[PDB]
């Protein structure tokens, strides 16, 4: 059975960074592309980007330049999304989710990152 | 850039009632375009890909139809499971978008 957990629930600061990570089994991540998908409170899914943790390959959406760092640690099936700058913008589930062009069939069930008032 | 205009953001709807996505590419995407649903408090899951695939278990009455930048998801007759969030993705060059959804509500 292919698996993706994810982190725990992220209460944070403005201006802050935080390190979202998630742990795949059931198949080895080296054989697909790994992806990050935002959903703000009551809103619709972003695709922040994704990475290809058999060469280290990164893309992202240009509005997530800079906001987002997607790694992967092949050692223990994990990848994670590095957070910068904290704002209200960024309280969201952040989705880790398996796939490629024939869709994604396989998702975490999401870390909520809740940032706190003032950015 | 490619992205997806997804109509309408909101659908209101009876058991029983057809009703009928769409979502418009601002580029052609050579019908790699998939639809996903998502129940209220869960993950998203893949219910249709390659425009009009089927995936695991999804039953006859959704059909995805369209081509280079035009597509379309009916549900024909909808249940009681079906009610939920819809989102379609495109998947030709990356960034790899997500339409703004379409959330389909029972009328109370």
């Known amino acids: 059975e292919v698996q993706l957990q994810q982190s725990g629930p992220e209460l944070v600061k403005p201006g802050a960074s935080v390190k979202l990570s998630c742990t795949a089994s059931?198949?080895?991540?080296?054989?697909?592309?790994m992806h990050w998908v935002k959903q703000r409170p009551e809103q619709g899914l972003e695709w922040i980007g994704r990475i290809d943790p058999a060469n280290g390959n990164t893309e992202y959406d240009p509005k997530f330049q800079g906001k987002a760092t997607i790694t992967a640690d092949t050692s223990s099936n994990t990848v994670n999304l590095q957070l910068s700058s904290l704002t209200s913008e960024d309280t969201a589930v952040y989705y880790c989710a398996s796939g490629g062009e024939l869709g994604f069939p396989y998702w975490g069930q999401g870390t909520l990152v809740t940032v706190s008032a003032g950015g | 850039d490619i992205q997806m205009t997804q109509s309408p953001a909101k659908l209101w709807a009876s058991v029983g009632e057809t009703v009928t996505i769409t979502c418009r590419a601002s580029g052609n995407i050579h019908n790699y375009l998939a639809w996903y649903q998502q129940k209220q408090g869960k993950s998203p899951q893949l219910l249709v890909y390659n425009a009009k695939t089927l995936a695991d278990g999804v039953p006859s009455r959704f059909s995805g139809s369209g081509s280079g930048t035009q597509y379309s998801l009916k549900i024909n007759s909808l249940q009681p499971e079906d009610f939920g969030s819809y989102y379609c993705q495109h998947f030709w060059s990356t960034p790899w978008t997500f339409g703004g959804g379409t959330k389909l509500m029972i009328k109370r």
């Open positions: 059931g198949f080895n991540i080296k054989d697909t592309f």
